[PDB]
Amino acid sequence: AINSMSLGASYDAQQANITFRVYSSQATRIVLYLYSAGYGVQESATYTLSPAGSGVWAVTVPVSSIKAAGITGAVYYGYRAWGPNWPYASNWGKGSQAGFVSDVDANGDRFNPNKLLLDPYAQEVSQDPLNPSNQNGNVFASGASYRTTDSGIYAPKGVVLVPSTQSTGTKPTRAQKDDVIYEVHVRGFTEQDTSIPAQYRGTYYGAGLKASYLASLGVTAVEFLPVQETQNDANDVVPNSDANQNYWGYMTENYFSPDRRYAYNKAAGGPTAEFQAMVQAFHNAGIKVYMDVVYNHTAEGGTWTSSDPTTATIYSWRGLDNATYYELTSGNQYFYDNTGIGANFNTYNTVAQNLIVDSLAYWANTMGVDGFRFDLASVLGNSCLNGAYTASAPNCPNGGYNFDAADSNVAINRILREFTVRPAAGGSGLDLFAEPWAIGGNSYQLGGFPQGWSEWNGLFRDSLRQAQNELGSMTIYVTQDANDFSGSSNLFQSSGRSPWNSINFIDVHDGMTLKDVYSCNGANNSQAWPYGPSDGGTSTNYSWDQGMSAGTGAAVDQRRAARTGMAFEMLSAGTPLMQGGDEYLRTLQCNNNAYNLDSSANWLTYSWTTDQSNFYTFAQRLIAFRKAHPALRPSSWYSGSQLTWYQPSGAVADSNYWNNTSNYAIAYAINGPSLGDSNSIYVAYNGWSSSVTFTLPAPPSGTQWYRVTDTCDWNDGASTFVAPGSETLIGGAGTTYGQCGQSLLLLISK
C-alpha cells in the first residue's frame, strides 16, 4: 500500500494541531525541535515523541502551544534521536558527548543526538546543508573530531505545509508511443533567456512560461533533471568557479521536496505551489512532465573514507535508522555500493521501499507529474539486504548485489503493483523509464526489466554513433542498424514488450550534446570557467569531428552528421528522446561530464546563428513529420508485410547481405496504410564514406516517391527538410538516387 504508516508532519482539518510521525526501529528516544527560522536560530520548543507501534513514533502538538512558544509564522522542525550506540544520558545537552558508546555499533546504528535530523517525509526544506551562510560540512559529521558538534542552527529544517489548493491541470492520456521527449535542466532552461522577465529566469515559474516554446518545437513531454531537493544553495558563493558546484542534482537530500533554489517564490509553501502551477502550464499545453528521480543513493553518501568506519555525514536518514535506509557491508560497519557515490539506498528493505513508493505517489498525485525516469535503475532491482547473506533476502545467496526482476519484492516490482502504468493505447497511468544499469555485479540490465518498464537504449546510442564516426576503426554491423531502426526487438521482444519501450537517443546529459558527438574527437573536460573543469565522464564517446581537424571535413559536414543522427532517433520505431538545446546545436565545447557547471556555458541560450536557426527548422519539421506519420510509431513490432529491408540495388536485403560485414548501406520501406498512415515511406542510410546509388523499389502505396529530406551537404540550408506538400518528385520503381556518403534520405509515396 501507499502511505501505510501515515508518516510526516501535518495539520488537522481546522489547523488546531499538527501531528508528527516518524519511523525508527532502533531509536531509544526521539525528540521534536521546533524553530521559527530554518537557519541560525535555536529551537523555540521541544517535545518528546512516543512509540506508536511498528517503529513509528508520534506526538501531536496544538498550534496554540507553538504560537505560545513564539512561532507564529511557518513551522520549521527537526528531530534528535538516541539509540544503542549513543543512549540517552540525563546529563546530555546540545553539543555534549554524554551517553556516547560508539559512532557505529555492531548492528549498524549511527545515532548522534547532537545532529539535528531532517524528516524524510518533510514536504519542503528550508535550506541545504551548505549555503551562503555556512559552507563547512564538518558540523554534520560523526567521528572523533566532529561528533559533539551540534548542527542544530546549521542543519536543514523541514517546513510543515498547509495543503495547497493549486491545480496541476489535466493529465494528458496520450500513448507513450506518440511522445517525443525533451530532457532539460529546469534552471538552465530559462536562466539566461531574455524573453522571460528577469525575476522568473531559471525557475519553475519561468519554465512554465516556455510551454509555448516546446509546443512550437513540437515535443510532447519535458523531462527534468532532478527537482527533488539537491545540494545547490552554495553554488554561487565563490564566483567564476565550478569548484563547489552541483548543477545536475543527482544528490537528493529529501524525496518529497521541490528544490527551493529553482523556485521564484522561496517562501514556505512557495516551491510547492509554484511547481504545481508549472505543471498546470505544461498540462495546459498538452505536454507531459516527467521527473528524473534518484532512489539508488542519497546525498548523505557513505563513510568519508573506506578505511575509517566512524566518519560519515548525518542530517536525515542516517541519524534516524541507518540500518533500515542504507545497505551495509557484512559486519555493518561500512556501506555496500553499486552507485559509486558511497552507499546504496536499501531498496529491498520494506520501510525504505515504502518511502520510494510514498514519495512517487506524492509527486504523481499531488504534484501532477506524468512519469518518472529512474537513475541507475538496476539498484531498484537488488534482492539483497546486506553485504552478507540473510534468509530475509532468500534470492540473494551471495549477499551484496544481485539484480532479480523475478523477485516480486524488489523495488521495481513493488512500483508496478502500487501504480497503474499507462496502457499501450493510452489512457491514464504513469510512464516509467529505467536507465537499466548501475555499477558492478550483474547490474548491467539492458533488456532485463519487467513488462511495464521502458528503458534507455544505450545500444541504440552507441551502435549508431559507431556507424557514423567509427567507419574503418571498428566493425559496424548493418544488422544492428536495422535493429536500431525497427525498435530493437533484440532487446525488447522476448520479455513481451514493444518497440516503444525502447527509449532511443543519440545523446543525453551524460556525455556530449548532439553537435558535440560530431564535432569532438574526444572529451575536453579540463577547460577553465565557464566550460570546466569537470572530472571525467565516459571514455567511450564514439565521437568524431568529421575530418574538421584533418582538413578532410568542414562545418557543413558536422551539420550533415548531426542531421543524420537526429533523423535516426526521430524516424526509428521506439520513443525518441532529445536533449534540450540539440534543436540549435548546443555545444559544451566537448565537455562530456558537465555535472558541476552552473554557468552560462551550461544554460540554454536563445540567440542563434543562421546555421543554428536552420537546424531548428530541420528539427521542427522532422518532429512534425514523425507526429504526422503513424507508420513510424508502431504499437507493436513491424510485421513482415509492413516493413521490407532493401539493399541499395533495390533488391530485398537477404542473408548474404545481412552477414556481409562490409555492407554499410541499408534502406527500408514501410507500408503506410497498414499502420494507418497516409503515405508509405522509404528511408535510406548510406553508412559508407562515399556516394552510393540507391535504386528505388515499388512504393507499397501510391505510385511515386517524393523526397522529404536529404541530409547531405549540398542540401544544407533553411529548407533541407521540406514543408509538407513541397516534397520533390523523385520517381517510381526503378528510379535511382545518388546518396552522398554518411547521410540519410527520407521519401514518402503519393
Footprint of Ca ion (CB under 5 A): 128, 229, 232, 259, 261
Please confirm, yes or no, whether 435 is among the known catalytic residues: yes
The span from the CA of 503 to the CA of 564, in Å, is 18
Q: Where are the beta strands (DSSP E) in 109-259?
A: 158-159, 181-184, 221-224
> Collapsing DSSP states into helix, strand and coil, what is residue 491?
helix
The residue written with cell numbers 498546470 in the block is: 280
- The catalytically annotated residue of 103, 109, 431, 435 is 435
Phi, psi of 652 (to 5 degrees): -60, 135
Which ranges in 47-130 belong to alpha helices (H)?
A: 63-68
Return the amino acid letter for 275: F
> DSSP states of 542-555 as a string?
----TTTTTTS--H
> Which C-beta is closer to Ca ion: that of 232 or that of 546?
232
19-50: string of b/e by CB count within 10 Å (b at 16+)? ebbbbbebbbbbbbbbbbebbeeebbbebebe
Which ranges in 236-371 belong to alpha helices (H)?
A: 270-284, 317-325, 350-361
> Which C-beta is closer to Ca ion: that of 153 or that of 227?
227
Virtual CA dihedral for 150, 156, 161, 167, nearest 10 degrees?
Answer: -170
Number of residues that make up the chain: 750
The answer to whether residues 113 and 86 touch, using CB atoms and an 8 Å cutoff, is yes
> Which C-beta is closer to Ca ion: that of 203 or that of 232?
232
Is 611 annotated for ligand binding?
no
Please state the closest distance from residue 719 (CB atom) to Ca ion, in A.
45
Report residue 80 as a C-alpha cell: 534528535
Is 484 annotated for ligand binding?
no
Is 191 annotated for ligand binding?
no
- The catalytically annotated residue of 109, 242, 375, 569 is 375
Please state the closest distance from residue 232 (CB atom) to Ca ion, in A.
4
Q: At what angle do helices 478-485 and 555-571 cross, to 10 degrees?
A: 60
| 57 membership: H or E segment, kind and range | strand 56-62
β-pairing, 454-456 vs 431-434, is parallel
Query: Other CB atoms closer than 10 Å to residue 65's CB: what's the count?
Result: 14
**Taking CA 580 as the corner, what is the angle to CA 564 and CA 232, rounded to the nearest 5 degrees?**
145
Task: Output the CA–CA distances (angstroms, integers) from residue 173 to 102, 177, 287, 422, in the order listed.
Answer: 54, 12, 10, 8
> DSSP states of 73-87 as a string?
S--EEEEEEEBTTB-
Please state the closest distance from residue 249 (CB atom) to Ca ion, in A.
8
Q: Which residues, at least 6 apart from 180, have a Cβ–Cβ distance to it below 8 Å?
A: 218, 219, 220, 221, 570, 575, 576, 578, 623, 626, 627
Please state the closest distance from residue 253 (CB atom) to Ca ion, in A.
7
Task: Output the CA–CA distances (angstroms, integers) from residue 107 to 26, 30, 329, 572, in the order listed.
Answer: 10, 19, 11, 52
> Which C-beta is closer to Ca ion: that of 234 or that of 328?
234
> Collapsing DSSP states into helix, strand and coil, what is residue 331?
coil
Task: Output the CA–CA distances (angstroms, integers) from residue 686 to 154, 473, 478, 560, 700, in the order listed.
Answer: 60, 17, 11, 12, 22
> Which C-beta is closer to Ca ion: that of 22 or that of 227?
227
| 668 membership: H or E segment, kind and range | strand 665-670
Is 230 annotated for ligand binding?
yes
Please state the closest distance from residue 250 (CB atom) to Ca ion, in A.
13
Closest CA to 185 of 603, 500, 633, 613: 603
Query: Other CB atoms closer than 10 Å to residue 1's CB: what's the count?
Result: 8
Burial class (CB in 10 A: 0-12, 13-18, 19+), 94: middle
Dihedral sign, Cα of residue 660, residue 661, residue 664, residue 668 = positive
The span from the CA of 560 to the CA of 594, in Å, is 25
Radius of gyration of the chain (CA): 27
Please state the closest distance from residue 700 (CB atom) to Ca ion, in A.
54
Please state the closest distance from residue 230 (CB atom) to Ca ion, in A.
5
Query: Other CB atoms closer than 10 Å to residue 651's CB: what's the count?
Result: 11
Is 12 annotated for ligand binding?
no
The span from the CA of 80 to the CA of 711, in Å, is 63
Binding-site residues from annotation: 128, 229-230, 232, 259
Please give the positions annotated as active site: 375, 435
Binding-site residues from annotation for Ca(2+): 128, 229-230, 232, 259
